[PDB]
Amino acid sequence: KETAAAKFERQHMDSSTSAASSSNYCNQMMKSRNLTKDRCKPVNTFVHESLADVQAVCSQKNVACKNGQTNCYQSYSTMSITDCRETGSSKYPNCAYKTTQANKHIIVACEGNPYVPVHFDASV
C-alpha cells in the first residue's frame, strides 16, 4: 500500500529541521519512523532538505550504485543530513543510535514513472 517513494520519504526525509535536533535525534526518529520495529536498523540517514530538492537529485549526476545497478544519482550541491548509527550497547527493543550531523553530497537510487528516489545509497 505504501509506495516505494513513500517509504523513502518515511525512512530518509526530515525537512522539518535544518539539522539534527540533538544528541537525542536518532533515538527518537528511528523509532517514530518505524525503523526499530522488527530489528534495529543498523545505519540510516535523514535528509534535511525539501522533498523537491531531493527528488531533483534523480536528474543530477548519474553514478554507479553500490550494488552495481546504474540508477543512482549524486547531488551537485551538498545537503544537510543526519547519519544514525547503532551503538555497540544497542539492544533491541531499546535501539540506541549515535546521531551525526554533516553537510555532504547525497547518492540516491531512483525508479518509476515519475522517476523518484526509492533508496538512499551513500553520502560523500
UniProtKB/Swiss-Prot annotation:
First-tier enzyme category under EC: lyase
Active site: 12, 119
List of glycosylated residues: 1, 7, 34, 37, 41
Domain of life: Eukaryota
Segments passing through the bilayer: none
UniProt keywords, alphabetically: Disulfide bond, Endonuclease, Glycation, Glycoprotein, Hydrolase, Lyase, Nuclease, Secreted, Signal
Catalytic activity from the UniProt record: an [RNA] containing cytidine + H2O = an [RNA]-3'-cytidine-3'-phosphate + a 5'-hydroxy-ribonucleotide-3'-[RNA]; an [RNA] containing uridine + H2O = an [RNA]-3'-uridine-3'-phosphate + a 5'-hydroxy-ribonucleotide-3'-[RNA]
Covalent S-S links between cysteines: 26-84, 40-95, 58-110, 65-72
Documented EC number(s): 4.6.1.18
Coiled-coil region list: none
Keyword Transmembrane: no
GO CC, one annotated term: extracellular region
Example GO BP: defense response to Gram-positive bacterium
GO molecular function, one term: nucleic acid binding
Entry annotated with the keyword Hydrolase: yes
Tissue and organ distribution: Pancreas.
Residues the entry annotates as binding substrate: 7, 10, 41-45, 66, 85
Protein location: Secreted
Annotated family: Belongs to the pancreatic ribonuclease family.
Subunit composition and interactions: Interacts with and forms tight 1:1 complexes with RNH1. Dimerization of two such complexes may occur. Interaction with RNH1 inhibits this protein. Monomer.
Role, per record: Endonuclease that catalyzes the cleavage of RNA on the 3' side of pyrimidine nucleotides. Acts on single-stranded and double-stranded RNA.
UniProt protein name: Ribonuclease pancreatic
